[PDB]
Amino acid sequence: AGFKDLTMLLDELKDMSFFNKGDICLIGCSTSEVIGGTVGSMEVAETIFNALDVVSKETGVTFAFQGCEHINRAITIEKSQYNPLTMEEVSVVPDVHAGGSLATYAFQHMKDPIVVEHITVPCGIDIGQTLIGMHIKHVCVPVRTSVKQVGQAIVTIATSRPKKIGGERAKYQ
Amino acid sequence: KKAGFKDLTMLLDELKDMSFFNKGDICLIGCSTSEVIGIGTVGSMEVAETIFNALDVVSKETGVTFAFQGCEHINRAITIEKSQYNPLTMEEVSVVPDVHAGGSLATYAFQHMKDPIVVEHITVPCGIDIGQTLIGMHIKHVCVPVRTSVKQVGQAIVTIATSRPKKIGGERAKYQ
Amino acid sequence: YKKAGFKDLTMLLDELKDMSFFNKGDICLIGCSTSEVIGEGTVGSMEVAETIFNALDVVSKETGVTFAFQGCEHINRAITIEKSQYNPLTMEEVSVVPDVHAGGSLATYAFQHMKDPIVVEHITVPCGIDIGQTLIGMHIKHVCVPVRTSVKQVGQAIVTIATSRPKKIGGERAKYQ
Amino acid sequence: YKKAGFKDLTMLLDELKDMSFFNKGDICLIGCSTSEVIGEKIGTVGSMEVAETIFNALDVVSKETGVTFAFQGCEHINRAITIEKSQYNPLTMEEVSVVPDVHAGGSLATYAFQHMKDPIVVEHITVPCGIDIGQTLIGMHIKHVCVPVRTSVKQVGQAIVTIATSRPKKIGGERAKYQ
Amino acid sequence: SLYKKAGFKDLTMLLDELKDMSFFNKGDICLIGCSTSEVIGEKIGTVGSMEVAETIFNALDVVSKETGVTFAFQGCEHINRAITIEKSQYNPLTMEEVSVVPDVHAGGSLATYAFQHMKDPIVVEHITVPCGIDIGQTLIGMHIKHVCVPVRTSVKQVGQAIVTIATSRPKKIGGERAKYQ
Amino acid sequence: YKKAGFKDLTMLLDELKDMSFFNKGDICLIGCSTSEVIGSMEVAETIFNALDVVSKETGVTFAFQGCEHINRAITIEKSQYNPLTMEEVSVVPDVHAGGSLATYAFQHMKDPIVVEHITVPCGIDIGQTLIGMHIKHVCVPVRTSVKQVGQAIVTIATSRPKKIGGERAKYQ
């Protein structure tokens, strides 16, 4: 099911250099979409969190976890990734029914978690159509993958690239 | 039996019934006509036409207006009627959407608007994404997905977003 | 004589009127702690809120100024205003219903007695009145200028009055008249 | 000093009119150094005479085209801009407290302030076009993207003149179309 | 010696109280708003007002060395409440240097004293800091990081000047189901 | 000295050096129209190379404004890119879409990037391309005895803080 699909998706992304040292990658997830209760949903969250952590150690990318709309899509990150110049800490503690399973799991298992109101990151992974485009550095570009689902959840992968500028005579090489 | 038409008509009727379209709002459309089919410019422009025309019916019924996201080659710049341009919140840019640099629907919309202009960025209260082009960068915070019984338009996955204010306040705060 | 703070507030408002503090079309931000007025309970606090809200409404009708009500820190000092004063260009609506223990007595009273209330995250206004040292400076248009009044308290609450004026710019040779 | 620059300025303004540079309802920013027009340091009487001639020529254009003018002050007043209050937009501009003087603001800004119906000074401004007489620099005030305008009249008296208009950013990759 | 002593005991007690409630954190900036005339309770000349400024500055400096907090000094409205800080605390990313030199009659006594006794002073147009102390109702809330929270103290005055203390904390967010622990 | 602009530019740069215009760690923005100098890649080369000498002597670095066809986007070394204050854009300056100097600079930098906007403390405009949009407020023109580079009018800008305060304010 979801574990096999996720493992394959992550290996594919690694192989296409989607995960870059020092980048933050935003995760949008709905564990219920993966399956199609809080015990079960937290087990899925655990598996996803742990798989992402392996990728983090292999590639040097770090992950940020989007909460659900009840907490205004506020984002859980490690304090070591907090930049006060670009981010604003907010007070809330993600819960299964107010944040969602993965953000809740991430908060509980981080060394020093904090929640920020907004974030801009160069890439992200959306599992189950929660939407993540508000978080991706302009210009947001979808990434085609061979693995299109994690369990029963549609997956969307986004990267980013600079705006192209200039008129008819402009060159790009 | 024209590609997408029946699914789109059903989706729009559903949205109407849930008061998704409000008089005076702008609704952003993200579309990939190739996703609807699953391939040339003739065919893609025919799909664009059907989508544009269905949206126009909704516009006349509800008083909502539509904005059309271009593809990444033109930096997702947005085509709108000049009557909806607000210089205080939007920045006009120079480009003319083309099938191979903008995409079929943005190109069709540009050509069939009374007085089109293209803006670099936009913030709108709701939107419809046909074919996973992504539209969340355009939706007023906080963006809320809308569940519909119609999941596809032709072969294209469809995503619907509305918006609502940030909920603020600590443990003792009230919301009614 | 029936209401705590009423005489002091009436005198303060008359003074402010006389110094042209209240201008047609301006928004004036009110910061209030009703417990400070009494000197430290929901019945009593709501009575004070009522008196303040009602007195301010009279001023509004006389001068054409409108009032915005700051909430407590539990609602992030969010501001309650009439929807007719909402400007989407400069303000951001947020979802919260002020309550006595989550917003404060005056914001709660104002919310319940407005025609069409909304709450915004932040606001910038040309003047304001702080009853009981809640602080209002974050809301006042730069440059914020304190206004001296002969009325220093409303009941037991210290009162602070702020207006605003443009930044003064220019080097040593600059002129100002 | 009452005649200095007059012929050149009049010709430059007529040229600009003829190329539709002045549009009804637009604001055009003026940067001026009256000493550059003469070509030497001149005293306040002379400098104010040059300011008067420039102001009056601009006013004729204003009445003919419906454009309005904004006047940049010198660096001593932080390049603050003098405009008619009727053109103040609090959403985009910030009023500042200063009264332009010949030795703190410059002759033209001072003259403009004194002869406007209801002048105010703002800290910054963004406008679609402008005219710089004597290389005071005005590009900080012009809407992006700022585009120099070629003119047949290149000087007003001894002052180099720079004319700027504006146009949208051109965007898109190599496949993008502009017509 | 009147003006050299005025406010000293009250200020020292206020600062000890604040220390005890962990108000002063290493590496934070604390904004000071002051009116020396309020401390005395009447208009006073420049000699006297500068003596009060000295006493305040010196008391704050003791706290600075003990806690590792640094102080920023708000000027009066004549200089648009511009703020005097040590250059070591200047962050060009978040602050904008302006040109003015605080004077007793254009800046106020404390900002003037601070400017003259700093190692390398700079004046900035605006600042956002996590906490502050207002002596004499000059208002300081425009400088405090959102969300600004008043701090209750048992010391209510420094001499004759009403004292207000502010700290800051993050916005609380989320709906009715949200958790904060 | 016969190479177009070279003598005038060398004198201008020496003058500026002598008035401490070039400071270690500053970025200086160059606006150039090589056609104005003459009346184009050879001129660009001479300018770029002269500026590079100054860079090594003073520790200032240079940023090169492109023409209006590329929205005055600015070419800089990546080592000077600050993502907090600048935004990378995709374009490669060309002689007919960027101008000769920006084109030359792009091709001869170690690791060039183009940014949409920039704010720098000082700049040099050769041929009235305009550069004031890039200069830190408050922008102050600098008078030089060298008025032209070849046939191109030259403008020099530095910057200083806003002066603030009312009539009683002091500035020393």
Numbering used by the authors:
A (entry chain E): -1 to 34, 38 to 174
B (entry chain D): -3 to 34, 37 to 174
C (entry chain B): -4 to 35, 38 to 174
D (entry chain C): -4 to 174
E (entry chain A): -6 to 174
F (entry chain F): -4 to 34, 42 to 174
Pull text from the paper.
Conversely, YwlG binding to HPF reduces the formation of 100S ribosomes. Our data reveal the moonlighting role of YwlG in regulating the abundance of 100S ribosomes (via HPF) and the important role of YwlG in glutamate metabolism (via GDH activity).
We replaced the invariant residue C69 with a serine because C69 was oxidized in the crystals with unknown significance. The hexameric structure of S. aureus YwlG remotely resembles the structures of members of the catabolic, NAD-specific GDH family. The inability to detect PLP or other cofactor binding in the YwlG protein crystal could be due to instability of YwlG in its PLP-bound form or the missing component(s), e.g., HPF, in the heterologous E. coli from which recombinant YwlG proteins were isolated.
